[PDB]
């Protein structure tokens with residue numbers, strides 16, 4: 001018999017955001033954003049009812065090196081706490097080994113956010129100076145990229161970041177943004193081009209994405225490995241992509257009401 | 261035993277090496293997909309035989325007979341174990357075959373003779389002096405055929421009825437037509453092949469406007485093939501090691517045939 005599908009997601013603008021009047025709203029109505037709209041479209045095409053739930057620990061997902069335990073949305077899927085993740089969850093090798101991913105619904109690359117006027121144009125620029133600190137989000141794919149990289153410039157960046165004091169890592173994108181904005185150009189933030197380009201369109205329009213992306217990947221809808229939901233959701237993603245609905249949702253949440 | 265790889269002669273993905281007539285087996289061929297096949301096979305631990313698709317087509321389903329041709333057909337009817345080629349991930353194909361996560365991104369794009377007065381798909385659709393078309397039996401044609409997006413629908417209505425036929429059998433042939441058409445023929449093809457051609461003599465073509473859509477190529481296996489899982493992880497591993505980027509830079513490497 002049909003059950004309500006438990007969707008794990010994360011409060012990350014503009015994917016999932018609290019609606020203005022959330023304090024008097026319940027269930028899915030509390031939220032708005034790209035992934036809220038996407039969940040609606042996927043559910044419609046797949047014919048299921050669902051319940052959006054914000055991941056408890058507020059993390060994307062990393063495996064503890066000691067205990068081998070997955071946290072974040074990946075953990076929610078791995079341990080059977082959610083049926084599907086509809087979020088800016090990056091497709092990675094280590095994750096692909098433990099959960100299923102649809103074909104990508106959005107492309108991104110790691111990128112550099114600076115306060116306007118910062119004399120940085122590239123990862124190479126960052127790696128060759130010490131005046132401007134830089135870091136990444138915790139418990140996500142960007143941090144793991146640097147930790148695992150065998151590419152010289154990135155390995156050099158990781159060697160710096162891992163030991164920098166105070167810590168250059170942040171717990172949320174918002175914290176990284178604030179750090180860039182408040183540091184008078186002495187902090188640059190390594191984040192996905194999607195979030196970077198979003199922030200670039202928000203007041204007070206004091207940040208910008210600089211240089212090319214450091215890699216190329218995408219977000220996928222994730223399900224527990226072997227989940228029967230996987231096939232249908234994947235086709236739904238390709239259909240929506242082909243129909244141009246994904247391009248429409250991107251423009252809607254990034255650019256249509258940009259503030260800059 | 262020996263994995264049979266179906267692929268297609270398409271520069272710079274798979275090309276006959278100089279003096280190939282005295283070569284044998286896999287050594288006859290060079291290119292991005294040739295190198296990729298080697299890398300995938302090494303990671304997955306299989307021996308393989310590259311074979312060029314008999315009918316020289318990517319893959320389309322005959323409306324009447326509902327039979328698949330091209331590489332898609334070779335997978336569907338058991339003639340090959342895997343396709344390693346610039347084979348576009350699409351909804352209709354995903355229904356009948358398995359695809360790895362993408363190893364390369366692309367979008368449908370416009371190729372014009374330099375100086376042609378066109379900067380967008382919209383421009384093309386709003387005029388009639390410049391003819392335009394696509395490859396036969398491929399994802400670009402099916403995209404326009406299936407599209408409910410206004411401008412693309414208009415372009416299709418024109419293309420389907422244009423006489424003489426605006427469709428071509430091969431990329432080389434569409435490119436020739438652009439060059440020999442004094443600018444009265446624009447070619448719709450994938451950004452990857454467009455950008456490759458853009459950097460080669462006689463440097464008289466160019467990619468204009470943004471891409472009309474966003475998708476990628478995937479390594480394809482028959483539905484439910486056990487090779488699928490390993491090949492998918494291999495793609496992600498190569499991507500994260502930056503080996504896919506290295507391959508792209510190598511085969512799209514600009515020796516400065518045009519300017520510089």
Ligand SMILES: CCN1CNS(=O)(=O)c2cc(F)ccc21
Nearest residue numbers: 103104105106241362365475476
């Ligand atoms: C987000 C759009 N999109 C739809 N799914 S896809 O055809 O598997 C794909 C592959 C890519 F390499 C880049 C984008 C992309």
Ligand SMILES: CCN1CNS(=O)(=O)c2cc(F)ccc21
Nearest residue numbers: 091104107217218361363364499
């Ligand atoms: C081609 C590189 N690449 C690696 N495989 S992926 O992480 O599934 C992916 C998703 C995208 F949306 C765009 C590119 C991309």
Ligand SMILES: N[C@@H](CCC(=O)O)C(=O)O
Nearest residue numbers: 060088089090140141142
């Ligand atoms: N999308 C990333 C989080 C953001 C980042 O790591 O930059 C992930 O899935 O882990």
Ligand SMILES: N[C@@H](CCC(=O)O)C(=O)O
Nearest residue numbers: 318346347348398399400
């Ligand atoms: N990559 C395309 C062929 C080229 C095109 O259609 O423009 C396909 O898989 O069908």
Ligand SMILES: [Cl-]
Nearest residue numbers: 181182184206
């Ligand atoms: Cl300031």
Ligand SMILES: [Cl-]
Nearest residue numbers: 306307308309
């Ligand atoms: Cl071999």
Ligand SMILES: [Cl-]
Nearest residue numbers: 408409410411
């Ligand atoms: Cl439209």
Ligand SMILES: [Cl-]
Nearest residue numbers: 417420421422
């Ligand atoms: Cl008709």
Ligand SMILES: [Cl-]
Nearest residue numbers: 373375376443
């Ligand atoms: Cl011209």
